[PDB]
Amino acid sequence: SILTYSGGSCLAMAGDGCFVIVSDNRLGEQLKTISMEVPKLHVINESIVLGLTGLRTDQQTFSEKVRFRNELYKLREEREIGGKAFAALVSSMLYEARFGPWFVEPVIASIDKRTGEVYLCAMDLIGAPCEPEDYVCAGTCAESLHGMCEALWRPGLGPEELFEVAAQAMLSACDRDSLSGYGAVAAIVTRDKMTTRLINGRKD
Amino acid sequence: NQYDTNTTTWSPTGRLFQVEYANEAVNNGSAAVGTKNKDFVVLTALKRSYQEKVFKLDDHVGMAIAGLVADGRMLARFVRTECMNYRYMHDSDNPLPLIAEIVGEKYQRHIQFAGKRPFGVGLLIAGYDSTGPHLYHTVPSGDVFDFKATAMGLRSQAARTYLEKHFESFPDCGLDELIMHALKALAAATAELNIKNTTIAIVGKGTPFMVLTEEAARKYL
Amino acid sequence: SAYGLTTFSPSGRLVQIEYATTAASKGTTALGVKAMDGVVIAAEKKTTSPLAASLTVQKVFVLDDHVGCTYSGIGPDCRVLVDAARKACQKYRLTYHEPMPVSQLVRHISSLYQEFTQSGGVRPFGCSLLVAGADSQGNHLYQVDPSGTFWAWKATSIGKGSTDAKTFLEKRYTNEMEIEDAVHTALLTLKEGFDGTMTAENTQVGRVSEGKFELFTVDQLKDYLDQI
Amino acid sequence: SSRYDSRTTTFSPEGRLYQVEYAEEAISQAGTVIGILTTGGVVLGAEKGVQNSLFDSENMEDKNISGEKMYKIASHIGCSVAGVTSDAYALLNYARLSANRHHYTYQEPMAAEDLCRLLCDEKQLYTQYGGVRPFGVSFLLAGWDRHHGYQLYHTDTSGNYNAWRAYAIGQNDQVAQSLLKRDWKPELTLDEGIVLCLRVLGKTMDTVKLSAERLEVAVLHKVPAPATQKLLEPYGVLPKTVPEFKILRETDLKPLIAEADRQREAEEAAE
Amino acid sequence: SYDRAITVFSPDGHLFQVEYAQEAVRKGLCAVGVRGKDSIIFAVEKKSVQKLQDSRTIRKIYKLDEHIYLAFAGLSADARVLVNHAQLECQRFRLNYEDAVDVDLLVRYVAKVQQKSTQSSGSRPYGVSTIIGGFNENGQPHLWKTDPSGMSSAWRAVAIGRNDKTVLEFMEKSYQENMTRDQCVHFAIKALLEAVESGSKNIELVVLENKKALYMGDDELRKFVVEVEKEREE
Amino acid sequence: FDKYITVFSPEGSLYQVEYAFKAVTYAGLLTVAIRCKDAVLVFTQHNVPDRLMRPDTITSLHNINKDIGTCITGRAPDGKSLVQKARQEASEYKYRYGSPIPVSVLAKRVADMAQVRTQHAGLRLMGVVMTFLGMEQNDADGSWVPQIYCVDPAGWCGSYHACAIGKKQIEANAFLEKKQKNAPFHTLSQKDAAMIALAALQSALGASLKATDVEVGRCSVEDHCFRRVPDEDVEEWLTALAEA
Amino acid sequence: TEHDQSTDIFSADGRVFQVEYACKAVDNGSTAVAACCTDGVVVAVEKILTSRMLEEGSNDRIHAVDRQAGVCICGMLPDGRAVVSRARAEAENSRDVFATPIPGSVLASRIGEFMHVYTTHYAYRPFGCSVIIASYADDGPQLFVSDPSGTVAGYYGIALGKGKTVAKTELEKLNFKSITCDEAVVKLTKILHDVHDKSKDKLYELEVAWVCNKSNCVFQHVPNDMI
Amino acid sequence: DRGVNTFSPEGRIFQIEYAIEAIKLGSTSLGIQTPDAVVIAAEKRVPSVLVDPSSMNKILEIDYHMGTVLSGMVADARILVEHARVEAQNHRFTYDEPMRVESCALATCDLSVRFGLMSRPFGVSLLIAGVDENGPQLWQTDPSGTYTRYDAQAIGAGAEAAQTVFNEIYHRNMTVEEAETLAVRILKQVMEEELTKSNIEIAIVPASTGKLEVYDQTKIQRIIDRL
């Protein structure tokens, strides 16, 4: 499968005025490992993080196109883009390739600076979105991740508690997957600050 | 004159001047003659340092030109191509009346649009098909005339005056007297006629379109 | 035809753009006033004769649910800009799922004016616009001219009676007006320059408030005219 | 229709292109614009027209992208224009698009002289092909790059460009160019440059006191680099300082206008 | 798409658009080339000295490939477009034939681009004359000139732009075969100062040798100018 | 120069547009349309000067579709070219949206065709006024209401209670203005409306009319279709006028 | 007087002068007449010969465009021939696409539309011919004329060219409801022999055609014995 | 003012007449045909002593058996000669034989006439000289796209003079020596400067070998001395 060739996984969770987003570090060619230091998160502005999984050449190409459109937006509009408009933009770029798709599956997390409202989105590879209020996941260990979050997530967590739950979900799922691992990186975003942490995992 | 610059401007008396001026290119070309009897057509032309004035268009048809040679050649390539397609599709000779119609129609497209120039050349087209011998004259305005005898070019009024006296006797003439009447008409538009400045061409019943060699033309000059 | 009709002249002037601007300044009078919680635009619609149906004459247009416009100058030229503006608003919603900001819509319009001052085979547009709308940065009122230049205003006027109207607004305008006091002020400013009797049938009014743009009906406008 | 063609791209009889000369005359009628190269940056200053009370703000969310006269092209390049305003917007969009495509392809910033050369080629094209009037614009460009450091270029209506330590375009450009030729020196700071710019605009406008409402000032300078996320980019390397284009507000100019009035009152005293 | 005919014949065989282009060239700054034994010099007048100009001057002698340089006279913006075309052709040639392009073949490509501009509907000629010089892969030097009509010729020394005809008469007398790198630099500076006023920072200069190119610095140039200003007093 | 192509004159005007309006009167005929309570009517002069012409082949009225009619006034072949473009437009609309085009929408589309030629060089303006007639439905109650819309050479598009176009239009409009002051035209019956339109024609031409000198069109609440009115129905309106 | 150099410009009075000038070419050409009987339609035209040495049929002015319809050209013949081609194409389109012989009124309106379009654009000139169209399809016998402006009308009888004022006078003394196609040929030929001017044009002949019941609604030249 | 396609009232195209004037202001070129061989020669005319005369060749090879001399605008001529070269190699590719001289003249004239696309005609006439199965030949091409065979001809500024020297001395039967000599005589007369051996070009194509030979400086001098 083309979506599992390169490896990697991503998860995002919502809390009370915060979110956490996490990725694994592996880059491979099927079962061969090329590097153990390739996180899959991209910071778009202070309020928005994008996680991309799928084939690595299309992650690199698609994220460069998104950064180019975002730069021209800021000069035309003289403001930062917000999370709902960013996901609509990404969905429109994927559907433009409806009949010859980009092999990527984006996860998007954002927080409205003013209100404190959190917005999550996950898309398939031709741009169909799903916008739950709890968590979104994608990548090679998606089925396991989806079940870990259903068991551990609960409403109204603060930054530090929500971090613990997301790290445990990512490490348990990666331990049952050959194509994702070597620890994880996480971003914790509030209205006021953005923290980043490196999580220790297994080395196989 | 405010109306003499473009093909797309009518004058206040209903004339098209650029088309009258292209027609003067023809009248200052070197003279050419054509004649026909019941079963032949003859063309003769003053070709004086040899300048090509007669062209074969297919087995059954050819022409003489007067005026701009590069326009002559462009029409020759068009008619050649048309006759080749007709024979490919039907296995027979392209009928002479249809050749004369497509040529007329191609001249006219070049007198109605600003991105085209009129053709500055006159043709005498001679051929032989299932309905007999035919002789047509075409001019830059797009008109096409079907003739028993005519002449075009410099001093071609004298040639036309000579043909008006004799033409009514041509149906009964044989091929040899018909060739002679054509040279005496061309002589009236003129140094004298030798085998090195005069072309003779023939087409007809049992005779594909051909240009006499210098050997064969000796018999008449 | 594919050559340019607008060209520079010895002192550096583009005269076809001035002549087009003269055509805009001979249209009938339109104006606009920005309050602290909305915007009003208004225009005269006098017909030439009572054989014309008044109702169908439009001087004020909806461009989308949050923004609208009025014009002075050549009406058929304005229709071309109104169609292009409507289309741009919908294209922006398809891509970002939110309303096009008024700043971006004005720039789109301005670049369409600029093309008709340079391309081959065309003359410039002969109308000025007033655009009024609401977005995340608040309420806005802009003017666009045949050159493609645009300005943001607190209050202004375009057309024949535009100098006297701008002098009258300069006196009566304050930074603390409510929306309803602005509708009053706009209708009073028109009445000054109006030749004849202002009626609810020969004038037209639009309003931005609570993030929406709406044309007044004839009936709504009658209530406001009976108070002034 | 061909008899009404004005022949905009045709040479005339001394090798002259008349539309290009006439568009240059339009520039010389526009608001004055000044540029100054210092050791801490580039300064750009412009006269604004007379200030009506009924004017409004666009109320844009980020204030350092565009004023009336100054525009950002990329993080390391800004400009200021004189001439036909809607023509300037068309070329500004072309420059923005060019500079950001380079960054897409090479993932590094476009060189300042390279951006200037693309812009001028877009002007040259309209003087040679295609039967329409040329653009009627002149730009001052300010940039920083790793090859030559701080730079200031000027572009004209023919598609020529040149490099300058200080320059002026618009209305009173012979007066401004004379004052700069006197008071410019190789060892100026950013703040000394801003004062030297306000005094030159002061003179050409011809007012004893500088109105803070009739001026605009922008700077291209280097500021401390921000975040350095080595967790998300393990091989990303930033330097200590990055270029920034900034449009000065009325609360940053207040002290610098004072210093420009004192030096004006001590130059009227010696006389 | 504008497709009007711009360059046409007039009644005595003249092409006026081409002669006007040749007038723009004669108004332009003066440029000179000189072929020696094993070097080629290019020297060009500059607009003027100012206090406000930036010390790092914009170059008006262009590199087309490692081994070929170009100087010009006429409209500077038209010349930049021609330089761009010739840079692409040098690389297209390596891609197709592997070898480096010969100088005479690159000169033919440039002349053909100029000639086409005098016969294409919808466009005017380039108002530019060029001097092009280089070394082949066997160390032999070439120096060529092209005009706005597309006519090309090879020279031992040549001048273009304003007062071309004066500088060319001076050079006709004094030129000698087989000169040294330093004797050539002298000869070129001397020829330029028939047209130009001073010799301070109103000259740029390039020295091209088999496998080395040099934009001369201000210090080395000052030395050569004073040596020449001394000999002009005699 | 401003006299020969579409560019502005110094006073802000377009001369080729003014001159295209003189082409409308140069043609020498007069048209009048009027809307009453339940219908819309159009009366145009039928001129057959030559005794050898076949009168039923000369018409200024045409159907765009079943339910919309036009009357051309001005340069006749120019008007026939706009009938063909309008027919094409109404048929594209029906393909795209699946319903017949409303008369107000069609008039606006033809008005845009005209505006394009005032702004691009090289194609002549069409020297006609086109009048469009038809019934249109309200969204409230679903009732049908008659309409008249005129489109001129500048690209202006407008609706009328009644209109006269052509030679002596100034005098015929004055006349309808007077009559309007008595009773608004939307209260009138067909017969009363018709007597006002025929009286205006006669007053402006300064002549008497037979049924063969006018051709008449009609749409009504009763029958939506645009149809020619029979000569016998016209005779009886003229008879009724000659009395009073 | 710059207003008369192209067909894309109105004059101040609302006229298009290039189209008027094109009409003057038709008014100086040879005369044509036609009549619509109860059986059919007859057309006749005068050919001015330029030489006594022409073959018969040279420079024919009358041409079939379908089995049941024909055209006669007045004014400039090569311009007329371009219209004949267009008409042939419209008649074929009607048979191939709609499976009908083109009705006479439709054929005339397409010819009008085609001629009008050359009065609108700076790069073309108006045609210098008027066309007489004669047809007998499922709409009965029909006779129409289209001129250089693109204006189209139907007639019972008509005359064109330099003899038209007199010829019209003589067509007004015919009875159109009663006349047959054999009588018509005699009357129409007489009118053309009488208006011929013997000073200016020395050599001429007549060309005549019809479509009627006698011919089985086939458009054709009349046999040369009936003159 | 008046367009590129306009005819004059005596039936000539103006741009073609003017292009022919530009050729009469050229350097002088000529050719002479004998039964043994064909000879072509040109005045070089360099602008200064600083020019390498090698770089200014007025005589070009098209293929082994054909060569050309040009007059008028040099840069325009290089476009035509590139076309002639490409045609002569296409003929070898497809038919495995050399192209005839007359066919190559014809191909060059089909390019020279495509203007109305190019803004103007080429201001060039060529003399083409070669050998094929009909022996030694000399053809002239000109801006009207006409091609003509000649026995001796000259083109350029000294043309009118050289046709008086030909009308005296040229007979159809000369030798290689008499023609070589007649060439350098005509040049001496009609030139401006004094005639050296590095100021003219000569070439021959002989029936014997059928290849083109361009004479060196050494061999030209033998022909100056023989005078």
Q: Please name the helix (run of DSSP H) or strand (run of DSSP E) that holds residue H27, with its range, or none.
A: none
Both tokens assigned to H123: 């201001």
Residue D260: alpha-carbon gap to chain centroid: 22
**Structural contact between residues D144 and D241, judged by C-beta atoms closer than 8 angstroms:** no
Residue A17: strand, helix, or coil: coil
List Cα–Cα distances, A139 to A66, A107, F73, H172, in angstroms: 20, 10, 71, 94
Distance between C170 CA and the closest CA of chain A, angstroms: 30
Alpha-carbon gap, residue D127 to D133, rounded angstroms: 8
List Cα–Cα distances, B35 to B183, C47, F17, in angstroms: 10, 78, 59
- Residue F1: list chain D partners with CB under 8 A: 4
Nearest residue on chain B to G75, alpha-carbon basis: B14
Both tokens assigned to F199: 């009286």
Closest by Cα among H67, H211, H80 to H138: H67
**Structural contact between residues A144 and A9, judged by C-beta atoms closer than 8 angstroms:** no
Between B14, B108, B149, which is nearest G78 by CB?
Answer: B108
**Structural contact between residues D88 and C203, judged by C-beta atoms closer than 8 angstroms:** no
Q: Phi/psi of residue A78, each to 5°?
A: 55, 45
Both tokens assigned to A174: 């990666």
With tokens 């075009």, the residue in question is: B152
Residue A113: alpha-carbon gap to chain centroid: 20
Alpha carbons within 13 A on the beta-carbon side of G119 = 30
Alpha-carbon gap, residue G43 to G188, rounded angstroms: 8
**Structural contact between residues A139 and A126, judged by C-beta atoms closer than 8 angstroms:** no
What is the DSSP-derived secondary structure letter of residue D109? Answer: P
- Residue C95: list chain A partners with CB under 8 A: 88-89, 92
With tokens 């000999």, the residue in question is: E231
C6 CB near a chain D CB, below 8 Å? Answer: yes
F29 CB near a chain G CB, below 8 Å? Answer: no
Alpha-carbon gap, residue G168 to F50, rounded angstroms: 10
Alpha-carbon gap, residue F46 to F56, rounded angstroms: 10
Flag whether F touches D (3+ CB pairs, 8 A cutoff).
Answer: yes
**Structural contact between residues A76 and A28, judged by C-beta atoms closer than 8 angstroms:** no
Alpha-carbon gap, residue D6 to C198, rounded angstroms: 48
DSSP string, B20-72: HHHHHHHHTSPPEEEEE-SSEEEEEEE-------EEEEETTEEEEEEE-HHHH
E151 CB near a chain H CB, below 8 Å? Answer: yes
Query: Taking each helix axis from N to C terminus, what angle separates C102-115 and A56-77, rounded to the nearest 10 degrees?
Result: 80
Q: How many other β-carbons are positioned within 10 Å of the β-carbon of residue H32? A: 26
Query: Taking each helix axis from N to C terminus, what angle separates G104-117 and F76-97, rounded to the nearest 10 degrees?
Result: 100
Q: Please name the helix (run of DSSP H) or strand (run of DSSP E) that holds residue E88, with its range, or none.
A: helix E76-97
CB contact under 8 A, G118 and B112: yes
List Cα–Cα distances, F53 to E162, G160, G188, in angstroms: 79, 14, 18
Alpha-carbon gap, residue D189 to D196, rounded angstroms: 10
Closest by Cα among E105, E106, E56 to E83: E106
**Structural contact between residues A60 and C88, judged by C-beta atoms closer than 8 angstroms:** no
Chains that touch D (3 or more CB pairs under 8 A): A, C, E, F, G
Q: What is the CA radius of gyration of chain F?
A: 18
Signed CA dihedral, F194, F195, F198, F203: sign only? negative
Backbone torsion region of residue A8, taken as left when φ is above 0, otherwise alpha when ψ lies between -120 and 50, otherwise beta: left
Alpha-carbon gap, residue A158 to A187, rounded angstroms: 14
CB contact under 8 A, A76 and C95: no
Both tokens assigned to C212: 């929406």
Q: Phi/psi of residue C200, each to 5°?
A: -75, -5
Q: What is the CA radius of gyration of chain A?
A: 16
List Cα–Cα distances, E223 to B113, F113, G216, in angstroms: 69, 75, 108
Both tokens assigned to F3: 């006299």
List Cα–Cα distances, F242 to F183, F190, F195, F238, H150, in angstroms: 21, 17, 10, 6, 94
Residue D41: strand, helix, or coil: coil
Residue type, A148: M
List Cα–Cα distances, H217 to H41, H64, H203, in angstroms: 13, 21, 12
**Structural contact between residues F170 and F176, judged by C-beta atoms closer than 8 angstroms:** no
**Structural contact between residues G7 and G128, judged by C-beta atoms closer than 8 angstroms:** no
Alpha-carbon gap, residue E121 to E5, rounded angstroms: 5
Alpha-carbon gap, residue B144 to B123, rounded angstroms: 10
Going by C-beta distance under 8 Å and a sequence separation of 6 or more, which residues neighbour residue B27?
Answer: B152, B153, B154, B156, H11
- Residue H116: list chain B partners with CB under 8 A: 115-117
Across B147-186, b (16+ Cβ under 10 Å) vs e yields bbbbbbbeebebbbebbeeebeebeebeeeebbebbbbbb
Distance between A71 CA and the closest CA of chain D, angstroms: 8
Q: Helix count (H) and strand count (E) of chain F?
A: 6, 10
Inter-chain CB pairs, E–H, below 8 Å: 87
Method: cryo-EM
Alpha-carbon gap, residue C220 to C200, rounded angstroms: 9
Between H23, H48, H52, which is nearest E168 by CB?
Answer: H48
Burial class (CB in 10 A: 0-12, 13-18, 19+), A18: buried
Between D10, D14, D177, which is nearest E23 by CB?
Answer: D14
Alpha-carbon gap, residue B61 to B92, rounded angstroms: 13
Distance between A106 CA and the closest CA of chain C, angstroms: 17
D122 CB near a chain C CB, below 8 Å? Answer: no
What is the DSSP-derived secondary structure letter of residue D69? Answer: S
- Residue H6: list chain B partners with CB under 8 A: 5-6, 18
Alpha-carbon gap, residue E85 to D2, rounded angstroms: 32
Going by C-beta distance under 8 Å and a sequence separation of 6 or more, which residues neighbour residue F66?
Answer: F100, F225, F226
Alpha-carbon gap, residue F83 to F71, rounded angstroms: 10
Which residues, numbered 173 to 212 in chain B, qualify as contacts with chain G under a Cβ-Cβ cut-off of 8 Å? none
Kindly give the residue spans of alpha helices, DSSP state H, lying in chain A. Answer: 56-77, 83-95, 142-152, 159-174
With tokens 């009987």, the residue in question is: G37
Alpha-carbon gap, residue F93 to F88, rounded angstroms: 9
- Residue B69: list chain H partners with CB under 8 A: 144-146
- Residue B169: list chain G partners with CB under 8 A: none
Nearest residue on chain F to G158, alpha-carbon basis: F52
Own/partner long-range contacts of B205-208 (Cβ < 8 Å, ≥24 apart): B205/B39, B205/B40, B205/B128, B205/B133, B207/B40, B207/B128, B208/B59, B208/B60
Distance between C14 CA and the closest CA of chain F, angstroms: 12
Distance between H63 CA and the closest CA of chain E, angstroms: 20
Alpha-carbon gap, residue A89 to D205, rounded angstroms: 47
Q: In what order do the strands lie in the sheet with A194-199?
A: A135-139, A9-14, A18-24, A184-190, A194-199
CA angle H160, H162, H165 (to 5 degrees): 125
Both tokens assigned to H136: 């030694």
Alpha carbons within 13 A on the beta-carbon side of A128 = 2
**Structural contact between residues B16 and B139, judged by C-beta atoms closer than 8 angstroms:** no
Q: Please name the helix (run of DSSP H) or strand (run of DSSP E) that holds residue A137, with its range, or none.
A: strand A135-139
For chain G, where are the E strands, in sequence order? 32-36, 40-48, 62-66, 69-75, 129-137, 140-146, 152-154, 157-160, 204-212, 220-221
Both tokens assigned to D188: 């100026």
Q: How many other β-carbons are positioned within 10 Å of the β-carbon of residue B119? A: 26
Nearest residue on chain E to D126, alpha-carbon basis: E123
**Resolution value in angstroms:** 2.2
